[PDB]
Amino acid sequence: IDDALYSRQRYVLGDTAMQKMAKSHVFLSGMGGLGLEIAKNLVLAGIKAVTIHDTEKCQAWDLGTNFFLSEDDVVNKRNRAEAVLKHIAELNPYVHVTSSSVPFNETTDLSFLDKYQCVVLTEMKLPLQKKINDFCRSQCPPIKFISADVHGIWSRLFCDFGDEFEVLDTTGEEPKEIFISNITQANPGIVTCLENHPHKLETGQFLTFREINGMTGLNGSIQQITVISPFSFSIGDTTELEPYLHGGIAVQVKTPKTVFFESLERQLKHPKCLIVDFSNPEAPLEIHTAMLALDQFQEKYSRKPNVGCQQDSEELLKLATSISETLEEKPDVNADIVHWLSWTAQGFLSPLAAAVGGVASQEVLKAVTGKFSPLCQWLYLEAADIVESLGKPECEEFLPRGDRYDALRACIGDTLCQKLQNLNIFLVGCGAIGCEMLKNFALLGVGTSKEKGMITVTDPDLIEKSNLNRQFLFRPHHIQKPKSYTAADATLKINSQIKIDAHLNKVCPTTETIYNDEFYTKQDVIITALDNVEARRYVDSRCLANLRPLLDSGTMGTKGHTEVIVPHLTESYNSHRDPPEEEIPFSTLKSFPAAIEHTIQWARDKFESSFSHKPSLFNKFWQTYSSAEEVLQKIQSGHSLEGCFQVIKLLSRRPRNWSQCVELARLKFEKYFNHKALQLLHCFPLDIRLKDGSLFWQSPKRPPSPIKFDLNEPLHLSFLQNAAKLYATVYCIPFAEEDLSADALLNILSEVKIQEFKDERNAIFQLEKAILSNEATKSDLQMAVLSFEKDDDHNGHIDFITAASNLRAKMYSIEPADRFKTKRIAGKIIPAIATTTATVSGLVALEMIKVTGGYPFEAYKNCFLNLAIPIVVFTETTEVRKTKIRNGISFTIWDRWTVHGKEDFTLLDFINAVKEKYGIEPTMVVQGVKMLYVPVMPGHAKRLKLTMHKLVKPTTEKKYVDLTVSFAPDIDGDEDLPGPPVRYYFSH
């Protein structure tokens, strides 16, 4: 497995998943938008063999739905399957793709389909789909059957994995570890968890146990549990065992799960749907009835309903009424659903297609690997909220005009398209999300209006090998190039009318000068693709300063979220908190590790301090002082120096050649991995007891153990090589690769002795010795300052860190970790997959339309997802909050008070103006982080008689500043009432 292209995928999935998805054959039929996007998603996944199929040909209408077709393809009237096979082949050299055009009908032999393992169907007639499902399910083993279809703003999804399907992992969440405090020899046994730390478990789960004192028989055994209290539960009988002494570790054991499906025809009479909006749980049944009625009408009349044809609407309504009573549940009929479906039966909508394609590709992954719980058994996505706010639009607005956007006009109408072409949107970040952003926007033809409509993207990042896995906009020949420029070049191919600005800037307060508020107000909506919350908060504060709409989303692995904010309607992004990574006391980290992550972190910090902090300190010290004899004289005169002892100790211990560096590495290993355990055990014997008499070296502490060196150990040799090469690189000592050979190193160490385990004058002596040896030259006061690089395979950073972490686990009797997990933890690499990002991209692009519509507060939604279940939720966003202060005065997050002043304007003038205008006296004034007036600190009382231009010292480019004010609480001794933002102008 080439890790440079699947590093994230390996962490998301696991080696078994990649092994299973290898040597896989998938058949897909229908070269529509849905087929194309599912195909690109699966190729990004990297299936060895995929075969596509289509019999139709290019049309001018297909331009608005396909992003790989070209006008030349439409001119030549080529088959849709052929004209794209090259472009999809460009995505992955390791993926073999085949195209087919074999005619399909009731008489077509299906025996050839046994070569594949799963089947995907789109744009197919229903009875043939039923027949195919019956044939696929009758196989031994049955072939996975997948079907999905899209009509306007309506989507249908069904799954069938046969009578029985097997899941090797229900959730994909790593099991936790606990500490055993007490156990009772009872029937049933009672287990007491350690103090605090509730198990958060559930009855019936299985745990395995180890290092239990007294009941050695419970070690290596698996017990089904029965939760009793938050910190205790029950196990089997233990009266026949020995008494419990101490210790014990329990870890949960995962269990394979078997599920069941049904045939398509049976599921049609009573679909097992999934709910995504709890507000209207009855809607999916009505939508399924409407889809079935639409299929009936299409079969009967061999045509789709016409817009403005009321007879079609009533015919479909009658069909649905006939169908509804026939259903097992016998539901009611939603007239508006039928009317809207009939109105817009001939449209196609892109982001809905993208989301459906992402979820379908994920379900195909579930089928091929069995790594997750499959969806059972139906799904229906819809976006009727956009057309609900339209009131009663006319059918004429939906009439086609003979352009590539005919489907979108049939969906929403020409007016919304016109409003769409004039939008000035700003985009920050150009990650994997930004690429499909640009693709969707190109599909929508945003900003194509010549007079108005502009897109801007800024990203300082360059193109990397691993980025190609998630970012399809970029090619292997684009490595080490600006993301923005390459993305713009790739996207402009699809549509020539795109007006795009690409920059290499990183958004930050320092670069805020180019991003003035006039630019913000010029923009109309902003989309985020950031990966860090600090820039997110900064962008939030920027947009709030302009009352501008903003969209934000985030994804890790199989989970994703979307959020919407509207001026004067909702709360800010900062209105909610985020849980940061927890802190670890050295009392753990330095001295008492209990997990591999602790050793990983300790090794990382030791590397950082040794190879980054120390060389920088040394070079700073020796650039501050030019002459070493000067330093010697200053020391001899008794003058104090900063960091003098450390730098003199380093200089006295400066190696001069390869062998000296090797010996230094050996002694460093000795100190790090032998002497520390000896000192710790000397300070604390293994038998040391506490006041209760309990062992100090009890849970969660692990006693250490010194380790004897062995060159024949590959780990020891690898770590020594890493340390030696790092030392040589740091000290600017050139070396040959043959020196790293085990034989040469053995020759070096064959004459190396090790000292056994057990100030100012010595430092002065060493300095004098260095001086008399002419070791104080200008070149001597230098070494390279290194930086961590997890993306380099030869620098040896990861090798050294992993070796050190494994050793640090070893003397503490801790299970080590492989290279990949160590690299992921050290770099804190975030796993991701194309399916989730594509789905959330489709969702946010869809919500952008509602943002454009200027719809009421009820139209918008936020969604949070976890396809591992799978689970999807849609909720209404938080409403704006009111904040009253005193005297009936209230305000919001969008309210901003403004005051105009003068050159002679003073603090007392400002207080008088504010108190007059709003009835409240500002008790304090602060400009951002620098105070301006706090009566508590002495000398601010005299500040009242100062010019405000003098007290502020502002920048000339800005004619106003915003300050923070507060007010005295009604009851003294209470916290001061916060004040809304105040914008002061220096002049009118």
Binding site: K200, D531, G554, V873, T878
Partner: protein, 76 residues
């Protein structure tokens, strides 16, 4: 009265509450079993976000009702 709190990743939490309890106390009850601070958790019922200062009777939460616990993500 019995209610269920289903968080993402499939974990199910059992709670005992009575009408008239306040949303902030209901969410503080979560900490006794999960360790999640009250200020860090958002809980959703029937497509609405439960605001602070209200009681269960206002949102019309009854026996065996299901509430979802959701969080925001940082990657991109």
């Amino acid at each position: 009265m019995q209610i269920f709190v289903k968080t993402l990743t499939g974990k199910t939490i059992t709670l005992e509450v009575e009408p008239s309890d306040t949303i902030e106390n209901v969410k503080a009850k979560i900490q006794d079993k999960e360790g999640i601070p009250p200020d860090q958790q958002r809980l959703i019922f029937a497509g609405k976000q439960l605001e602070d200062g209200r009681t269960l009777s206002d949102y019309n939460i009854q026996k065996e009702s299901t509430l979802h616990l959701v969080l925001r993500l940082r990657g991109a």
